[PDB]
Amino acid sequence: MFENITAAPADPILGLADLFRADERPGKINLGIGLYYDETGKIPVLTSVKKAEQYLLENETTKLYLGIDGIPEFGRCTQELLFGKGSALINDKRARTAQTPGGSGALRVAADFLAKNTSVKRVWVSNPSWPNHKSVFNSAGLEVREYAYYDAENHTLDFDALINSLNEAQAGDVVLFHGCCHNPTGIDPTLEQWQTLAQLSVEKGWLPLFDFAYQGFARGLEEDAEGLRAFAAMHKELIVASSYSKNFGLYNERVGACTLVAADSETVDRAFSQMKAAIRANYSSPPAHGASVVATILSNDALRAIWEQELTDMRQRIQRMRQLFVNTLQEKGANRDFSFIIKQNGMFSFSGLTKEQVLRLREEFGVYAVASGRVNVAGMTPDNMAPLCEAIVAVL
Amino acid sequence: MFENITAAPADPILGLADLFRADERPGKINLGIGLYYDETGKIPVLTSVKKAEQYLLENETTKLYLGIDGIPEFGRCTQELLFGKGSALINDKRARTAQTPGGSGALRVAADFLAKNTSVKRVWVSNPSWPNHKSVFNSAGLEVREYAYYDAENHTLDFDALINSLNEAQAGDVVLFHGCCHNPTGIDPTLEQWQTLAQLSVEKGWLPLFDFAYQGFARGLEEDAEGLRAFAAMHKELIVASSYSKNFGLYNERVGACTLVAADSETVDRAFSQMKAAIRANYSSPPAHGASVVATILSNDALRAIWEQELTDMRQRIQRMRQLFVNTLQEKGANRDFSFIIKQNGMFSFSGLTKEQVLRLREEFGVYAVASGRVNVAGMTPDNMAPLCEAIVAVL
Ligand SMILES: *Cc1c(COP(=O)(O)O)cnc(C)c1O
Ligand SMILES: *Cc1c(COP(=O)(O)O)cnc(C)c1O
Ligand SMILES: O=C(O)CCc1ccccc1
Ligand SMILES: O=C(O)CCc1ccccc1
């Protein structure tokens, strides 16, 4: 039965991890996958989390199945984070949230729900986009088309080219937007540009789907939610696929949420019941650990305070590494001007390196980046910065 | 977009929990969902688990994403429990295992992989069956057909009808078997019947898929694996979806696995690359907590000792409630003879109650069972036995 199966290619990002874990080279540097590293070169568990965990160990009395949609309080917390202190979506009970295995799982859940209960046939994604967007969508039988976004010659968001691209998208089509910290470009719309896209998508008849995995890494919690919040004032319906993997450093526990919004309560209720059905046919109910962590923290004043501080610390360390990256490239004798990099946000930097440069940086110097030229700034340190910068320079 | 969505009917099993939750009549009894309860009527966290968790709290230094297939240890251990200590399957490197979110998740992963990579078009499940098998397979776009199994009148496995019904299975069809503790009948084939079924399947050209979620609740860890092991000696290819929800009381941490077997290392290798691709398009990588707990316990001699004993205690307590249940029915007024109940394995009893009978027990007396008349023996206690036996009696 399997005699004929054909070997699949590997995950361009996660597969890189195996490549990495196999060199026996001494000074290998991982600028691959989007993990937050500290000054000392490690991927720590946050303190607020360890604290939360201790609380769980002592107070949990059962491992009882959660309801298909997970922990209710986790749902509440997600919504305020998402929409605001006393938003009307919340007040009007227009939103329903299901806890899922990561934002990756929320993506799959939204896709299955769409493909089965609606007339959606296509999903529009940005070019360039996060590689897994295509796999998830195609999997549900949906078609993936791309819209113009990044201005390569000028390292900017090419608005009208974006806008002209989307003019080809039909009413009833799905349009996928990254909430903040566009992966992999780092370039986000202005609040103004967001307001425009919101007005337009209402006129054009598009269903918006937000992939929000980076809340708090751009400018802050509440401010990173502006675009989304702007869409939300205009729209009757929308979907949010959010992740707590990065802002809580809880990568392997898979904590995320799928938030569904409709014009009103009665409608969201009916719609949500079909979402739950798509869950039931998938993993049944979500993993408790990571999400209980998150609700515990969000729910406790003290813990919350410590957590926000850790988040702000993470963001600042990255802002610093970015300034230090360009300076040293400079001082190390690079050909190009790399200052645009200072203008990107989030963990990465869409560096402008070619496929073969990235390939070379790796065979030859043990530095690991994604083929697209995406480099993990959060994996940079004062101690690895020089060697790193030399490698790049050597390849340009 | 969501205007015309029809509300979906709730999960027959998990939906009962909700109702259960909203019932406020004082002495309600839950014999619905398959959770293990104790003498005092609690769903406790195992002692071996609490220990392993303390261990993790103190020794974990990172939440780094696991690989698509999970923790290697977890895989290795799973295959031993499965195929036994020094099996050829393991020695010949013919099996690959992926850690998944529960056995539910393993069922979905198998489905997507088969649907996308072979000519499989139909899955055969038993009558009666576990409600979720249908949902998962259909979602992957596979046809679900039923095979005869239980003899209502004599409360036993009807081998003939079993065999006669499968005659229509075509070569290349998938046949799904429950490893031990048939849910919901509680009737399992004998070793010799297993030996027979394994001969056919090879002759007839079927791909077997084992749903193995109750290892250790019938007779013991190794005894419970006999049927599967008998199949494994004949077959070249096999699929196993197992779970640790029940044998570890880890219901909400979603711990399970999907094991793929091929005639050879190279073949299983290529085949599993496609399984990984199906995961990638789903939830990406699995939740660490629960599975780390399992690997911890299985890889430590003393924790493993405490664990095996806890499992033996659970099994024993159930067998005790089983006899007490029949005894009390009889001694309380029953018309029927419920003695056949003693011959079933696992947590439940296919009591022979009517749909209207169960609706009534719920409505009138606050007792909760599953519509098919399946009752959770593991939810029974010396203190609730009386009132429950009376409820039943009153509806006969
Ligand atoms: C990380 C991230 C996700 C979600 O990842 P999970 O670990 O599955 O939560 C989704 N989209 C983008 C662009 C991401 O970077
Ligand atoms: C419990 C069970 C499963 C798996 O349940 P999970 O909690 O998802 O691991 C699968 N099949 C049957 C018949 C079960 O009883
Ligand atoms: O590096 C990233 O882009 C974020 C981490 C990630 C990678 C691949 C699948 C999901 C999450
Ligand atoms: O009670 C059962 O049959 C086991 C628990 C369960 C219930 C519903 C979906 C997945 C698992």
Swiss-Prot record, chains A, B:
Any one Gene Ontology BP term: L-phenylalanine biosynthetic process from chorismate via phenylpyruvate
Subunit and partners: Homodimer.
UniProt-annotated location(s): Cytoplasm
Gene3D superfamilies for the chain: Aspartate Aminotransferase, domain 1, Type I PLP-dependent aspartate aminotransferase-like (Major domain)
Main location: cytoplasm
Induction per the UniProt record: Transcription is increased specifically in response to 2,4,6-trinitrotoluene (TNT) and its indicator compounds 1,3-DNB, 2,4-DNT, and 2,6-DNT.
Name assigned to this protein: Aspartate aminotransferase
Lineage start: Bacteria, Pseudomonadati, Pseudomonadota, Gammaproteobacteria, Enterobacterales
A GO term from the CC aspect: cytoplasm
N6-(pyridoxal phosphate)lysine: residues bearing it: 246
Outcome (variant: residue 133 to A): Slight increase in maximum velocity of the overall transamination reaction between aspartate and 2-oxoglutarate
Catalyzed chemical reaction(s): L-aspartate + 2-oxoglutarate = oxaloacetate + L-glutamate
Record keywords, A-Z: Aminotransferase, Cytoplasm, Pyridoxal phosphate, Transferase
Pfam family, one: Aminotran_1_2
Family: Belongs to the class-I pyridoxal-phosphate-dependent aminotransferase family.
Known outcome of mutating residue 374 to A: Reduces first-order rate constant about 10000-fold
Cofactor field: pyridoxal 5'-phosphate
InterPro entries for the chain: Aminotransferase_I/II_large (IPR004839), Asp_trans (IPR000796), NHTrfase_class1_PyrdxlP-BS (IPR004838), PyrdxlP-dep_Trfase (IPR015424), PyrdxlP-dep_Trfase_major (IPR015421), PyrdxlP-dep_Trfase_small (IPR015422)
Use in biotechnology or industry: Has been used to construct a 2,4,6-trinitrotoluene (TNT) biosensor strain.
Disulfide bonds: none
Organism: Escherichia coli (strain K12)
Superkingdom as given in the UniProt entry: Bacteria
GO molecular function, one term: identical protein binding
